[PDB]
């Protein structure tokens, strides 16, 4: 009952953590796409 | 009680899990950019 609600709140915190991890993974993919774009930029420049 | 005790641990570990997962995700993500740069360099 009450322990179930507390575990639900803890699982909500863990789900926020997982959503943050997924958003960070997507952001990392975008950042490394930008890094590949930059690498191509100075590579074509070189 | 059980309710007070249980919620604290997972909430505390959530931030560490998010940080570790973000760092790992960036770790393999940078590998793709490094591989593309290596192919371009070759």
């Amino acid at each position: 009952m009450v322990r179930f609600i507390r575990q639900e709140a803890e699982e909500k915190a863990n789900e926020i953590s997982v959503s943050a991890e997924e958003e960070f993974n997507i952001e990392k993919l975008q950042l490394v796409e930008a890094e590949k774009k930059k690498i191509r930029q100075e590579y074509e420049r070189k | 009680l059980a309710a007070e005790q249980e919620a604290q641990h997972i909430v505390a570990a959530a931030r560490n899990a998010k940080m570790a997962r973000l760092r790992q995700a960036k770790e393999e993500a940078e590998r793709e950019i490094a591989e593309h740069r290596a192919q371009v360099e070759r």
Binding site: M1, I5, A9 | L1, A2, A3, E4
Partner: peptide, 17 residues
Amino acid sequence: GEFFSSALTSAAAQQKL
């Protein structure tokens, strides 16, 4: 303070709170 032990027992029996 006197009923803290009874409250702890009641929380244990009945049961982010």
